[PDB]
Design a protein around this ligand. Structure first.
Ligand code: G2D
Length: 305
């Protein structure tokens, strides 16, 4: 389609500090949000209706992520722990202790039997969901880890760091398979596998997004026009309608690019602070965006294509 037409439908207020990370449940019914106010909040994905608040962390939360069956959440906190939550009961099932600094990023594998985490302690850890035990500690980087993500079959982990590196790890052995970006500058602020696991979306703190061919280790696409020099902003593949790249920006907008042509197709105006997190609904043309302390709200946008 030439361009989407995302429009603001709901604004979700409730957090009392900067929002950090929003994620749609895989079954499409929920939006989960995490914030520096130490709280997780669950919202109706289609009407933004507040459902519950999930509490337990002693310090702010930087990231949250859903299990495959939409029943569990994992959260990553400045209190140096991750917590596994049962969403329906709101109870903490396990506290994952081991990191010696802020836990900044987390994700389930598709099987939902493992959790990967990255921390300011410059390590990546792989946890067993059932027992809460740390299975592997990877000396992954030499600076804070900005993102960790499994691929579609769970056999690979991509990690990024302020040391300027992006590395790909073999889940079963923890050994490095490849260093995709091997520079000491700029800091690599976010990474994510494409849905099919063949490409890696990478953000760097020079206002640049890139699409990398994992197998070839080569950059295929470069996306520019937004502002990103200070913070680790989430970025997404939007696949429900047109094939877009979606990202927040430090000029308080949501940017949407055509994946193939690299042209900006839309910019969503409304937030009053850095749009730190964006997320794309699994089935509908819906985007969730969240902003830092001057805003503290979540916005839901819907497009016809
Ligand atoms: C990594 O080291 C730093 C990062 C920041 C930074 O980005 N702070 C921003 C403000 C608050 C906040 C909350 C969450 C996230 C976040 C989590 N996650 C991503 N962003 C992407 C994936 C998981 C970021 C930020 C600041 C300093 C260092 C040393």
């Amino acid at each position: 389609p030439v361009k989407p037409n995302y429009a603001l439908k709901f604004t979700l207020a409730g957090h009392t500090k900067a929002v950090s990370s929003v994620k749609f449940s895989p079954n499409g019914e929920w939006l989960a949000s995490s914030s520096a106010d130490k709280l997780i909040k669950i919202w109706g994905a289609y009407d933004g209706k507040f459902e519950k608040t999930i509490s337990g962390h002693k310090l702010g939360i930087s990231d949250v992520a859903w299990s495959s069956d939409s029943n569990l959440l994992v959260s990553a906190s400045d209190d140096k722990t991750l917590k596994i939550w049962d969403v329906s009961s709101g109870k903490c099932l396990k506290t994952l202790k081991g990191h010696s600094n802020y836990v900044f990023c987390c994700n389930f594998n598709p099987q939902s039997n493992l959790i990967v985490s990255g921390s300011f302690d410059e390590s990546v850890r792989i946890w067993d969901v059932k027992t809460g035990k740390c299975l592997k500690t990877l000396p992954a980087h030499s600076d804070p880890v900005s993102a960790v993500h499994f691929n579609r079959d769970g056999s690979l982990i991509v990690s990024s760091s302020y040391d300027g590196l992006c590395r790909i790890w073999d889940t079963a052995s923890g050994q490095c398979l490849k260093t995709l970006i091997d520079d000491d500058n700029p800091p690599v602020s976010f990474v994510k596998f494409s849905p099919n696991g063949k490409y890696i979306l990478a953000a760097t703190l020079d206002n640049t997004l890139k699409l990398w061919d994992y197998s070839k280790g080569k950059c295929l696409k470069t996306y520019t026009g937004h502002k990103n020099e200070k913070y680790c902003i989430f970025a997404n593949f939007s696949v429900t309608g047109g094939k877009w790249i979606v990202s927040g920006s430090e000029d308080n907008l949501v940017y949407i690019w055509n994946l193939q042509t690299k042209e900006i197709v839309q910019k969503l105006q409304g937030h009053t602070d850095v749009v730190i997190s964006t997320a794309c609904h699994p089935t509908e043309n819906i985007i969730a965006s969240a902003a830092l302390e001057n805003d503290k709200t979540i916005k839901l946008w819907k497009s016809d294509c």
